[PDB]
Design an enzyme around this catalytic site. Structure first.
Site, short mmCIF file in Angstrom:
data_model
loop_
_atom_site.label_atom_id
_atom_site.label_comp_id
_atom_site.label_asym_id
_atom_site.label_seq_id
_atom_site.Cartn_x
_atom_site.Cartn_y
_atom_site.Cartn_z
N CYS A 180 4.08 25.81 -44.85
CA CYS A 180 4.45 24.54 -43.99
C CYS A 180 3.66 24.65 -42.74
O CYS A 180 3.50 23.47 -42.10
CB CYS A 180 5.81 24.59 -43.70
SG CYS A 180 7.05 24.24 -44.78
N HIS A 316 8.52 22.05 -34.87
CA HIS A 316 8.40 21.96 -36.52
C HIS A 316 9.40 21.01 -36.69
O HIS A 316 9.23 20.13 -37.68
CB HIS A 316 8.73 23.61 -36.76
CG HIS A 316 8.45 23.45 -38.58
ND1 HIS A 316 7.35 23.37 -39.18
CD2 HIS A 316 9.41 23.70 -39.47
CE1 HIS A 316 7.36 23.31 -40.24
NE2 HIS A 316 8.69 23.57 -40.69
N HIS A 354 8.82 15.71 -43.97
CA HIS A 354 8.00 16.84 -43.95
C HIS A 354 6.92 16.85 -44.92
O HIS A 354 7.03 16.06 -45.72
CB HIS A 354 8.98 17.94 -44.56
CG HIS A 354 8.47 19.33 -44.19
ND1 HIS A 354 8.96 20.24 -43.42
CD2 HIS A 354 7.45 20.11 -44.80
CE1 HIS A 354 8.41 21.36 -43.22
NE2 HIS A 354 7.34 21.42 -44.19
#
Lengths: 749, 748
Positions: A180, A316, A354
């Site tokens: 990620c 994030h 995301h």
């Protein structure tokens, strides 16, 4: 300019390209960011059935028909990147999309085809989806040669090496993965590989294509996922995490090189830390509070940046109920400041979801755009703070509406956090740059000229339609200069003239133009004429002034009187001499050979033949200059100089007839030409093209218009010769129009 | 020890591990390397057919029945790394194998369960096989959540993060891929992460496993795959490359730290370079002359190494007929010197085949072993040079026999080159450290004790049978020392005493111990005993000497000495002075306390309570020296001390009865305590283990034998306390005995 203390650890973001959801360009991406709109597209059951998703999954209520997808998965310009159609068909869609995004990032850097003296490393990542694996491996294997070639081309593992092979990049080429934080890890390795000096440029940033585009996803309670199809970071209604697609590439330089080369710089990465959680969390997919706090503290200490001075943090921000307060508390602990409500928060996953291998470069590109525009965006889908966010006693407020950067947080410093599933946490401190001095008060500047070029005319039409939102977003002067010097040229050319009020006027083609003819510039007899081969219009050009200083330095030791040896004074005393006219014509022809490097013939009648010959190199400048002094006063006992050969790409003419290595030793025809002083215009037929300006030149930009019309023909005009000693700052021009052929997905269950 | 210049660019390879074809350990790997053993195996049709390969594919004549394979890809010790059995079933068989190889590398570095203060990065890279994708996605997707967890555990790209999670490494953890150079690129950016200061240790490595283990391959003209199953680099009959499985991890550290921590260093990476071919070749899968030449030149420049000082080059050596002259020519034109045939050429792919994505660390591990052992190995399957190879006008010769590293090549520098299909070229310059001194001077002095330990007795038996090849290869004394200080302790323990001829004797356990009894050190009366608390045997310890020097520096300010001081001649008046017997007892006791961390009782027969309280802190050290001097003169009245607080733990006793906080404050207990008893088992029965050594003690290794028997009897031992001021050097001890569980591959 940077305007903070420069340690050695300074990496400049000099060009970024995206293909995020509803964000085909960087300006569409910034538009979605500052408008604060979610980019997830909720689909319909007919669309899912068209894409191959069955009603036995459509009726399942834990199947959210939403995906932040990318337009243009199946479109690829095969021949531009060196592929056959068979090779581009066997290519992964991630390979094709990041080919185009990486080329657009080099183009935005200004280095689209000038990667020769620079070492350029490719540090890209790519997520893996099992759907492309099912499609590509489920096809019939055939032979072993085809299977080896398919494993080479059609896997994401060789993504970076395909990009480097197509773009001819010979630096450290790695294909990274930290799942990620893949693309901030790639940006960190790029920054470290630049600070060590392994490469001079660096392409960083990853890509995720979930093969089934326009599909949905199975929400499930044991997972973390958005239950409704929206990502709500730091929000009371935080449903979970929405997995979009994306592709982002940044181009990175050392700040010393990027400032020296005049590159536009969005932001500079002052410091960057990478750690891992290890076992210091709950499980493998859990976030780590102390690992995130340690990476933010290490990057801030790295960047020699006190978190007092940070005014934005791109978190994030996955939109989960439990990971957002851990991220907020880690940020609060690393910002051990006791100053309340000064730093903004943000999450690009509110907008584009995301992205899972371009999530880090999404946050980095968003933060670089935030610092470039000095605009704090809104955090999308946010009304109420999450109930266990201790937001009031914290450094961080959350912006609900877009605002400019606070005045008391200057220089603009910001942080980009991306925390992996896998434990790899990356933090980067980014500093904004001080904005450029636009000395105009929206006065009448000039009509600027934007030289569009494409290998085919329909792509040139795509460019010309692309220029309208581009002029809506930027200013015309830097866009014009960037399309002049920072874009590669191709066959089909078109110049667009843009005035102060924005009107895109296509420049007309050249008249009396014949194909396959040499390009020549003729100067008449300077005894009667006044124009010194258009040198009153090149008087600004910082190259004519350079050659005027060269002839001043040569003349000082040659000639007596002061009025001939001061530079920049020759405009008023232009008609008062002939040596001044010859020196002006020398510097004018030198600039007219710098411009139009394919201008091959030089021609000159009467006493302008000595400027033509001394510029061409067929006669040395010394005897031309002092010989021209006696043609100014004496006209007696002319001394015919040495027979030099010219610059070997160039060639002289007398009136259109090339007097080249067939008569050149004769003292006869030289003195017959020079002593005649006739000035008579050249003949009608020479089978060449003359650089002849229109006679309505009165404004110093009609000459730029004429050399733009020359550029629209076969001339490869070097536009840097034209501009004054304040050169324009570069900025961002057009993106390339790709000849989008279509390659379908071989879909099989 | 290094003998070159410290620019601050050097990275030490301090621990390596392999799992290569026919190479389970590092020593099997080096044996295959020096013998030039081709580790490719050839199968019969029944072996391949029973393995699961179709009869049509067998009797295809374009099928080559050969594969250099890893033994034991289905075996894994899940409970060691925190995996349940289904969770390790969902691990791909590169995650399992590289957990084991990565732990073996970290253990070979001596940092197994010692990575607390050190920041450790994982830089590994696997190569994805299409066949395990066929296995893992041929399984039914019964749930979405199971698919998510099986996509984050099953995919190789979370390999590095799985390793870092299981080993608790919290540095820069990346998963990389550059093709035939994946693991040297991993080593390269591990080196840059160390040099920048991002991590203090770095596990760099790579792994391929093509999951039909024991299965052939397909060769034809358009592939580089070998016609006959033999990889013959730089050879006249070079058929083509031969792809095998492989895994290998190096542990890297900055050289200043590796010298400061006393690490065993195989080789030192002085400099590394990575470039790409770019478009400057014919195709994407072709090699490139200019890229290889530029990367060898750049690595030699950054290592500050002249190419005439390089004595061995581990090439890519892929075995193709076209790429081998290209790589030789790039090496020749990168080696600008005009010297002829001073550098040996190596290619580990002659032995183990092209172990894709572990080929770089295969060559690096082979080169680091070449520099460590100072032995130039043969190039396997080499008979004649290729017709396009000009060995005569070149810096290179191809060794056919295992030659010693020549003199006039010190310090031993070597280059390793791995050149990816994909274009990424990595070249590294490695320098060997120095040979070990071996300052025994070929004499017999001491049996030495090897503390094996394992979590179960089957694993401990496996670890015990590890010692026959380990003692066949390694030095026994350094084997014992790095088992003593650089291996983690578990519950099932066994010490193997090895004499100077090398014969292994298991060390017999303590036949009289009580399991829950706290351990105690009894010291007798000082007025009658000429012997202190085994101090005549503890005199050679560095810790005892330090404590004696510090104690004498406290002593001489107010001792009114008889000049019997300075702590180097206390054995001279160890028969007469009660002062130096008392002080010697204090230093010894305290050494025994630091040597055995689970020491509790300090019972004393009378006047031994002063050393006992000196260690346990109930009386200050200056106070017991002063009061014991007053007991030496003894003409005046007895002294009552300041009676300080006790240290946590380390509780005092009198004969074994722990007396604290009842009469530890008043007077007369000390009077009837400092009057002597002269009784050894004065407690009667109290269920306390004592540190009463065996009565026959001659050789001074007998006390280390007793301490080893204490270690084997369930208590930790700080073994570094025992040794003198020249400490022994660490080395390679023993691969961990992983409790293997079979996890079968899914069908199809």
């Amino acid at each position: 300019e940077y305007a903070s203390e420069m340690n050695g650890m300074e990496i400049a973001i000099i060009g970024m390209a995206v293909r995020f959801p509803q964000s085909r360009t960087l300006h569409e991406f910034w538009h979605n960011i500052v408008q604060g709109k979610e980019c997830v597209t909720f689909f319909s059951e007919e669309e899912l059935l068209a894409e191959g998703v069955e009603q036995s999954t459509l009726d399942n209520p834990a199947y959210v028909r939403a995906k932040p997808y990318i337009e243009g998965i199946c479109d690829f310009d095969a021949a531009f990147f060196g592929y056959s159609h068979k090779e581009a068909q066997t290519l992964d869609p991630k390979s094709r999309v990041l080919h185009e995004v990486a080329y657009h990032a080099l183009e935005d850097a200004g280095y689209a085809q000038r990667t020769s003296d620079l070492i350029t490393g490719v540090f890209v990542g790519a997520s893996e989806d099992v759907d492309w694996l099912r499609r590509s491996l489920s096809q019939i294997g055939g032979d072993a040669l085809n299977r080896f070639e398919s494993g080479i081309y059609g896997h994401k593992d060789l993504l970076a090496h395909l990009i480097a092979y197509s773009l001819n990049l010979n630096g450290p080429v790695y294909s990274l993965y930290t799942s990620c934080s893949t693309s901030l890890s790639a940006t960190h390795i790029a920054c470290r590989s630049l600070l060590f000096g392994e490469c001079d440029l660096a392409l960083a940033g990853g890509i995720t294509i979930d093969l089934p585009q326009k599909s949905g996803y199975f929400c499930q309670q044991g997972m973390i996922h958005s239950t409704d199809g929206h990502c709500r970071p730091f929000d009371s209604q935080a449903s979970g995490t929405l997995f979009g697609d994306g592709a982002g590439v940044v181009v990175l330089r050392r700040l010393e090189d990027a400032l020296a080369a005049g590159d536009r710089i969005y932001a500079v990465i002052r410091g960057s830390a990478v750690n891992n959680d290890g076992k210091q969390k709950i499980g493998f997919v859990a976030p780590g509070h102390e690992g995130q706090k340690a990476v933010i503290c290490a990057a801030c200490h790295l960047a020699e940046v006190s978190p007092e001075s940070i005014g934005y943090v791109e978190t994030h921000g996955t939109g989960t109920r439990i990971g957002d307060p851990i991220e907020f508390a880690a940020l609060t602990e690393a910002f051990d400041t006791s100053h309340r409500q000064y730093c903004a928060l943000g999450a690009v996953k509110a907008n584009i979801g995301h992205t899972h291998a371009a999530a880090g470069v999404a946050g980095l590109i968003k933060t670089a755009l935030v610092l470039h525009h000095r605009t704090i965006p809104p955090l999308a889908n946010y009304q109420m703070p999450n109930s266990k966010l201790d937001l009031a006693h914290s450094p961080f407020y959350i912006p609900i509406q877009p605002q400019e950067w606070p005045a008391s947080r200057m220089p603009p410093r910001a942080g980009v956090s991306s925390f992996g599933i896998g434990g790899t946490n990356v933090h980067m401190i980014l500093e904004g740059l001080n904005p450029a001095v636009r000395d105009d008060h929206d006065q009448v500047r000039a009509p600027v000229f934007i030289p569009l070029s494409a290998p085919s005319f329909e792509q040139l039409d795509e460019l010309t339609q692309q220029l309208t939102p581009l002029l809506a977003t930027l200013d015309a002067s830097t866009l014009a200069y960037t399309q002049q010097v920072a874009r590669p040229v191709f066959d089909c050319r078109r110049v667009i003239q843009v005035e102060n009020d924005g009107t895109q006027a296509m420049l007309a083609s050249l008249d009396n133009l014949m194909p396959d003819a040499p390009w020549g510039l003729h100067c008449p007899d300077l005894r009667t004429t006044n124009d010194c081969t258009y040198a009153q219009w090149l008087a600004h050009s910082a190259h004519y002034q350079r050659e005027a200083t060269a002839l001043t330095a040569l003349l000082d030791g040659m000639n007596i009187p002061p009025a001939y040896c001061h530079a920049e004074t020759w405009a008023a005393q232009a008609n008062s001499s002939l040596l001044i006219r010859g020196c002006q014509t020398i510097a004018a022809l030198k600039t007219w050979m710098n411009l139009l490097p394919t201008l091959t013939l030089l021609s000159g009648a009467g006493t302008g033949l000595l400027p033509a010959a001394a510029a061409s190199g067929m006669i040395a400048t010394q005897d031309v200059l002092h010989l021209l002094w006696e043609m100014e006063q004496k006209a007696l006992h002319l001394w015919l100089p040495e027979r030099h050969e010219p610059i070997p790409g160039y060639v002289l003419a007398w009136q259109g007839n090339p007097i080249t290595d067939a008569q050149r030793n004769d003292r006869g025809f030289w003195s017959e030409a020079l002593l005649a002083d006739t000035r008579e215009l050249g003949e009608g037929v020479h089978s060449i093209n003359w650089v002849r300006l229109p006679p309505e030149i009165r404004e110093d930009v009609d000459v730029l218009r004429y050399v733009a019309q020359l550029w629209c023909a076969g001339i490869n005009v070097d536009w840097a010769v034209w501009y004054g000693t304040p050169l324009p700052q570069r900025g961002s021009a057009s993106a390339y129009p790709f000849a989008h052929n279509h390659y379908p997905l071989p879909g099989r269950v």
